[PDB]
Design an enzyme around this catalytic site. Structure first.
Site, PDB file in Angstrom:
ATOM      1  N   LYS A 118      66.924  69.665  53.434  1.00 34.56           N
ATOM      2  CA  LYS A 118      67.627  68.777  54.265  1.00 34.56           C
ATOM      3  C   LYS A 118      68.472  69.021  55.460  1.00 34.56           C
ATOM      4  O   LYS A 118      68.631  68.253  56.311  1.00 34.56           O
ATOM      5  CB  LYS A 118      68.766  67.899  53.241  1.00 34.56           C
ATOM      6  CG  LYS A 118      67.849  66.958  52.008  1.00 34.56           C
ATOM      7  CD  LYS A 118      69.048  66.091  51.294  1.00 34.56           C
ATOM      8  CE  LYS A 118      68.370  65.183  50.471  1.00 34.56           C
ATOM      9  NZ  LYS A 118      69.564  64.318  49.723  1.00 34.56           N
ATOM     10  N   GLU A 202      83.885  62.585  57.438  1.00 29.93           N
ATOM     11  CA  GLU A 202      82.696  61.623  57.800  1.00 29.93           C
ATOM     12  C   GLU A 202      83.245  60.313  58.228  1.00 29.93           C
ATOM     13  O   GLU A 202      84.336  59.915  57.871  1.00 29.93           O
ATOM     14  CB  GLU A 202      81.754  61.764  56.806  1.00 29.93           C
ATOM     15  CG  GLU A 202      80.959  63.300  56.605  1.00 29.93           C
ATOM     16  CD  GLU A 202      80.377  63.727  57.992  1.00 29.93           C
ATOM     17  OE1 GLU A 202      79.903  62.979  58.675  1.00 29.93           O
ATOM     18  OE2 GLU A 202      80.466  64.688  58.190  1.00 29.93           O
ATOM     19  N   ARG A 295      54.909  60.786  52.994  1.00 31.27           N
ATOM     20  CA  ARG A 295      54.211  60.381  52.073  1.00 31.27           C
ATOM     21  C   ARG A 295      53.898  58.874  51.873  1.00 31.27           C
ATOM     22  O   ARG A 295      54.904  58.171  52.214  1.00 31.27           O
ATOM     23  CB  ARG A 295      54.690  60.973  50.907  1.00 31.27           C
ATOM     24  CG  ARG A 295      53.674  60.731  49.584  1.00 31.27           C
ATOM     25  CD  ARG A 295      54.522  60.889  48.213  1.00 31.27           C
ATOM     26  NE  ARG A 295      55.265  59.780  48.122  1.00 31.27           N
ATOM     27  CZ  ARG A 295      56.610  60.137  48.249  1.00 31.27           C
ATOM     28  NH1 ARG A 295      57.151  61.135  48.483  1.00 31.27           N
ATOM     29  NH2 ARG A 295      57.660  58.823  48.173  1.00 31.27           N
TER      30      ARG A 295
END
Ligand SMILES: O=CCCCC[C@@H]1SC[C@@H]2NC(=O)N[C@@H]21
Lengths: 678, 566, 85
Positions: A118, A202, A295
């Protein structure tokens, strides 16, 4: 380019049949794969050839990528489609396929490896310039730094902590110009939750709704983004119901979602089909990147109902084979237009009343909803199982997918309702009742549902119809008749018949009594929960004389006196009676009455147990003192002229030894007392 | 009390007490036993192969069989010479004769295994079989007894083990009303052991007696004359409802070709002396004249067809049945069997064996709390109700009473019986003798012998002494006998006879160690020199020898064999 | 179709290898490529296994309920492939 005539599939289930079908239209060969047994499964009955791979555990089956590659080489396979799961996300397997020379279907190995971590992925998107909401900025070096970037990097304040979900440092402090409470909140969070003193700030979003656009790319530098999607409804990170046309989404936004998505895919480089996922807050009005998947999703046929290319139906898997062909595209982003709305729902072989635990059992009767067009709506069902099949515990519980395309949302939602109702399965409890409850009472027909939408309405849901005393009457009657000639040819003297059934509904036994008056098998009565009435009953053809685990499936008719009439297809077994009709489906458990029928001994067993004859000389005792002995093991072995003659006592309860090995004992001595465990 | 079913559920469920749930845990003890069993079957299953295609084993790795090395080249030469003649030297005639897809039994096998000791000390007579092969065969929908004379004439046609095998086959066929088919190839007689085989009773004359007593009871019999049958062997073609003489090599003689010489020795061709004379001679001897082996076998089959037994067998034994397997794996049968050569008797169980063999792994116990030594109850074997007597421990008077009661019920309701033999186990206590134990033993034996029920016995192991008289024995007319590898048939005591006979044999008080070396070791050698492999079957004592794992199939063959009976 | 030999194998052979997908074929086009055609797949030894097994089972209970003593079963089939048994 390279010709393809043989197609290989990795996984099993609905995707196997889907990949196999279109293949027929392209006129290409097919190959199937199956685990130990698993040979009666449908997909193998759909392919041209199938190969067994090995033991049921996923480590043993569908994970030996090297063995799969060697087998494919021996078969001279042209292409492999991994599908989703197993080796769907593994760059080593794709690289080995490329080295072997087979056209892998999907992204290159580099993209999969990069998106595996990530941190490096978010690094790549941050370099690309896509609006991304990060997880962290630095650390809590200074408390004044918190005020420095509080109004700087991210005005919304997400205090939280370095780790842990307690989040008491948050305090839902959405008010800026906060400087005397944020530091106090963080310092009180540090207490008893010290962890690491580093703190990350954040942006905090009050609301969250998930978005995910689709994309497609050839290998000749040309692509086009498909329509958006919504996955707001999910329980415990499991997809439940989704909508390809995000209701309440402005056209202009749709357009832009594409420009952002194409930038990210081009930056990493991409070939084939994929999906970018966003996270969105209505109050802010902006979307921030969360994750992408390299995918094909499971939700591909859903978005299809809301997109047409050059006025023709779109097939997502088709293009992926054509992408592997090396041919370039034929359409710009323009040729694709949306038409109407559609909704989807997944059915899981789990029990809603329980902890959504999967159950494995044979599939007795499977109703199939009308998969044809009628009115202003299209409804389809795709199932990876059929009649006579059995669910495997190793696999995930997944039966079928139902999709209701329509010209308007209303039509689509209304369509499903009826379809969801119509589809019926007998043998294993399902969540189909839950999904219908999720659709009727919740006023989500408006179209605004958050990510946590399921959490608040849990009280309202998890509700099923109440078993009326009448339902017991048809259910009880079926078990008799669907087992024997009860009430058939019966006859007594100057009296009348009687026969009773015991149901273990919930944790309370239920008794139902049935009897007749006159010379009529037809006229029948009932008395359950102190409620009495009359009805007549007319059966159908007698079937399933072998009365196996599936037992007997027959239709029934019941004319109750009030005036009604009913039709009930009852597959009854000793364990339970299942009745399906206009009421719905209900399975009633029969009161269990089993308990070592025979060996029911409460005798004290005080003395004179496993007594040995005169010679004695006990030795080699292999039983521990004070251990339960229900099965007749050799408690003591005594030898009389080479006569082991083991006693082999079967008295239940722990056995207490009063002798030791090698001790000569007299005739009929109390070697041990076999007493009930107290 | 809160319990009100209707007997089923309690019944017709996968949870009835009738079944049995002895599940093994595969521990060392299991391994020690399971492994040995494996050590007790490999060669059993092997020697069979060696006698089959006897003396010609091209692998030359038959060290698993303790059989001595034999001249393979001589046997191959003999077989080549015989097959060049035009006749099939093998049991091939049999499996050609029986319908494909059907069963077979091979009643007596390994017959005459290393029986006779020759003049050469290290050499035994090479009788790979008894000179014949015998098994139950189903021909054209008709169950029949098949007896085939092997072409081994090197030692001589028939021995004291050959005529006994033939007579056992004839008695079995007469008891069960299965027609016989004889495949005749002979070298005449054996003029060396002729006193042992020709005169007296139960000899070569009783074959002729039986072939007439059968036709009195209208049980048709068929013989095929592949080669010469002289020296009284020519009467079977004469005493036969149907007989077959092959065109070239089929010959029948009452006097040998050498015999015409020295008594009006006007020698002429062997054809004219009594062989196959296809020239429309005056003699109406021999029903069928067939040009080839296949033609003769085909005519034998065709004659077997026209007997009308197909309807009767099809009605009596249902051809279309659903097999019901036991609940536990039959490979586990070797494990519960203990080891061998153990100073003191090891432990043993029965429940597991019966639960492994019977249908659905079930049983119907009579009184088991009382006379806990002996086991008796009903069962199911492939669609047929059966009674089993299996022995476990030292017999008491009460065990004998229970056995008598069970046999009484079984005879009353016409239920077949199965026997699983074990130790003698007669207590010698003075109180037991004073309690009239002899009377109760007589009570048991009287019922055993008096029973008209068909009876089959199979050796579990350790059948030594007069105890078998309590359960069953060859002298009590069992229509079949079969054996497991770990069997010992001996005097009233296997181990104790050693101790008892040590005391009372011209022994001085001193020299104790040398005496026990000369007495106890010697009697142990004597009483375990006999065994399943040699003393039995080879001498047609308990003629059948089987594997413990495949017992239920064999017993089902036996029961289907004993329902054509009157 | 099962029961009579057909030329269906020939037509497929006429369609795969010949490069007549271009579209130019003469009247005598069949004459020159006769060597290339008239070709059929080779019967692999496995094909005999399924074919041989079917004849037994599709005729009787061969291998059904079969049983012998201390031995193992055996049954054989003879095929007259081409001119060689
Ligand atoms: O418990 C002691 C009594 C032992 C009985 C042994 C029995 S009696 C008959 C048979 N012959 C033997 O040598 N032993 C057994």
């Amino acid at each position: 380019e390279r010709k393809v005539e043989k197609l290989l599939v990795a996984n099993r289930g609905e995707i196997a049949c889907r990949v196999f079908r279109t293949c027929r239209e392209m006129h290409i060969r097919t190959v199937a794969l199956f685990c130990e047994a698993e040979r009666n499964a449908k997909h193998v009955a759909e392919a041209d050839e199938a190969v067994c791979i090995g033991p049921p555990p996923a480590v043993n089956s569908y994970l030996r990528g090297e063995h799969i590659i060697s087998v494919a080489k021996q078969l001279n396979v042209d292409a492999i489609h991994p599908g989703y799961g197993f080796l769907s996300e593994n760059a080593s397997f794709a690289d080995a396929i490329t080295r072997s020379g087979i056209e892998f279907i999907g992204p290159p190995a580099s993209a999969i490896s990069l998106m595996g971590s990530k941190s490096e992925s978010k690094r790549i998107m941050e370099a690309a310039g896509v609006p991304v909401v990060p997880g962290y900025y630095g650390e809590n070096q200074n408390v004044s730094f918190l005020a420095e970037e509080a109004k700087k990097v991210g005005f919304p304040i997400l205090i939280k902590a370095v780790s842990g979900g307690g989040g008491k440092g948050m305090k839902i402090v959405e008010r800026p110009e906060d400087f005397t409470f944020m530091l106090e909140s963080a310092k009180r969070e540090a207490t008893n939750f010290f962890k690491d003193d580093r703190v990350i700030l954040e942006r905090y979003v009050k609301r969250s709704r998930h978005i995910e656009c689709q994309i497609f790319f050839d290998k000749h530098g040309r692509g086009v983004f498909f329509f958006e999607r919504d996955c707001s409804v999910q329980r415990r990170y499991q997809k439940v119901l989704e909508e390809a046309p995000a209701p309440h989404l402005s056209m202009e936004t749709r357009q832009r979602i594409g420009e952002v998505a194409l930038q990210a895919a081009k930056a990493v480089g991409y070939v084939g089909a994929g999906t970018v996922e966003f996270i969105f807050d209505t109050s802010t009005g902006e979307f921030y990147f969360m994750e992408m998947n390299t995918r094909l999703q499971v939700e591909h046929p859903v978005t299809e109902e809301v997109c047409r290319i050059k006025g023709a139906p779109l097939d997502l898997v088709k293009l992926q084979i054509k992408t592997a062909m090396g041919k370039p595209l034929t359409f710009s982003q323009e040729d694709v237009t949306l038409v109407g709305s559609c909704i989807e729902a997944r059915v899981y072989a789990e029990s809603p009343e329980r902890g959504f635990l999967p159950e494995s059992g044979p599939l007795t009767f499977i109703r199939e909803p009308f998969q044809g067009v009628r009115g202003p709506a299209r409804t389809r069902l795709d199932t990876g199982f059929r009649e006579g099949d059995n669910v495997l515990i190793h696999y995930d519980p997944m039966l079928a997918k139902v999709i209701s395309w329509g010209r308007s949302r209303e039509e689509a939602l209304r369509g499903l309702r009826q379809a969801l109702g119509e589809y019926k399965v007998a043998g294993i409890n399902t969540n189909i009742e839950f999904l219908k409850r999720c659709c009727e009472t919740p006023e989500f027909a408006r179209g605004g549902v958050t990510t946590n939408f399921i959490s608040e309405h849990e009280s309202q849901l998890l509700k099923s119809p109440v078993v009326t005393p009448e339902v017991a009457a048809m259910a009880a009657t079926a078990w008799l008749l669907n087992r024997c000639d009860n009430w058939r040819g019966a006859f007594r003297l100057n009296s009348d018949t009687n026969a009773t059934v015991h149901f273990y509904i919930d944790d309370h036994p239920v008794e139902v009594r049935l009897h007749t008056e006159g010379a009529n098998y037809h006229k029948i009565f009932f008395s359950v929960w102190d409620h009495d009435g009359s009805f007549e009953v007319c059966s159908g053809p007698v079937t399933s004389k072998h009365r196996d685990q599936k037992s007997i499936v027959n239709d029934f008719t019941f004319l109750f006196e009030n005036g009604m009439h009913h039709t009930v297809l009852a597959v009854a077994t000793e364990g339970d009676v299942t009745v399906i009709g206009s009421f719905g489906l209900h399975q009633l458990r029969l009161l269990p009455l089993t308990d070592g029928f025979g060996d029911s001994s409460t005798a004290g067993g005080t003395s004179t147990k496993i007594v040995s004859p005169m010679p004695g000389k006990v030795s080699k005792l292999l039983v521990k003192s004070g251990d339960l002995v229900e099965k007749g093991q050799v408690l003591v072995i005594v030898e009389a002229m080479k006569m082991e003659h083991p006693v082999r006592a079967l008295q239940d309860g722990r056995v207490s030894f009063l002798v030791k090995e090698g001790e000569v004992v007299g005739g009929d001595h109390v070697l041990a007392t076999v007493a009930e465990e107290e | 009390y809160a319990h009100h079913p209707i007997d089923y559920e309690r019944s017709t469920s996968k949870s009835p007490n009738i079944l049995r749930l002895p599940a093994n845990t595969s521990d060392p003890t299991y391994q020690e036993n399971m492994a040995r069993m494996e050590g007790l079957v490999e060669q059993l299953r092997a020697r069979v192969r060696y006698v089959q295609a006897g003396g010609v084993v091209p692998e030359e790795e038959a060290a698993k069989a303790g059989v001595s090395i034999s001249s393979i080249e001589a046997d191959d030469r003999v077989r080549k010479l015989h097959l060049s003649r035009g006749k099939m030297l093998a049991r091939d005639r049999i499996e050609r004769l029986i319908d494909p897809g059907t069963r077979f039994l091979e009643l007596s096998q390994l017959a005459g295994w290393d029986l006779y000791w020759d003049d050469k000390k290290k050499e035994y007579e090479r009788c790979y079989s008894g000179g014949i092969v015998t098994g139950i065969g189903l021909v054209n929908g008709v169950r029949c007894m098949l007896v085939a004379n092997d072409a081994t004439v090197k030692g001589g046609t028939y021995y004291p083990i050959t005529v006994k095998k033939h007579l056992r086959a004839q008695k079995i066929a007469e008891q069960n009303h299965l027609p016989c088919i004889y495949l005749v190839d002979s070298g005449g007689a054996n003029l060396s052991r002729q006193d042992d085989v020709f005169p007296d009773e139960q000899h070569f004359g009783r074959i002729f007696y039986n072939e007439a007593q059968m036709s009195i009871k209208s049980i048709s019999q068929i013989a095929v004359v592949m080669g010469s049958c002289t020296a009284g062997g020519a009467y079977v073609p004469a005493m036969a409802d149907e007989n077959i003489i092959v065109a070239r090599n089929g010959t029948i003689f009452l006097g040998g070709p050498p015999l015409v010489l020295a008594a009006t020795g006007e020698k002429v061709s062997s054809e004219e002396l009594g062989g196959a004379d296809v020239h429309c001679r005056i003699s109406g001897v021999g029903d069928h004249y067939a040009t080839d082996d296949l033609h003769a076998l085909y005519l034998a089959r065709r004659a077997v067809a026209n007997l009308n037994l197909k309807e009767h067998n099809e009605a009596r034994n249902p051809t279309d049945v659903k097999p019901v397997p036991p609940l536990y794996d039959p490979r586990e049968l070797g494990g519960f069997i203990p080891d061998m050569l153990s100073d003191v008797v090891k432990s043993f169980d029965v429940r597991a064996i019966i639960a492994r063999i019977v249908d659905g792994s079930r049983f119907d116990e009579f009184k088991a709390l009382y006379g806990n030594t002996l086991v008796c109850g009903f069962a199911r074997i492939e669609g047929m109700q059966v009674g089993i007597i299996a022995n476990q421990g030292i017999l008491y008077s009460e065990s004998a009473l229970k056995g008598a009661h069970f046999i009484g019920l079984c005879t009353q309701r016409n239920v077949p019986l199965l026997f699983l033999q074990n130790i003698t186990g007669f207590m010698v206590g003075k109180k037991y003798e004073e309690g009239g134990i002899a009377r109760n033993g007589a009570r048991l034996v009287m019922a055993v012998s008096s029973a008209p029920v068909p009876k089959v016995t199979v050796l579990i192991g350790g059948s030594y002494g007069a105890g078998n008289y309590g359960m069953c024995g060859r002298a009590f007319e069992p229509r079949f006998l079969f054996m497991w590898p770990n069997a010992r048939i001996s005097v009233m005591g296997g181990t104790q006879a050693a101790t008892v006979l040590t005391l009372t044999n011209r022994n001085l008080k001193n020299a104790s160690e040398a005496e026990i070396a000369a007495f106890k070791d010697k009697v142990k050698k004597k009483y375990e020199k006999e065994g399943s492999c040699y003393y039995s079957t080879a001498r047609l004592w308990d003629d059948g020898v089987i594997a413990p794992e495949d017992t239920r199939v064999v017993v089902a063959e036996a029961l289907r064999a004993t329902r054509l009976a009157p």
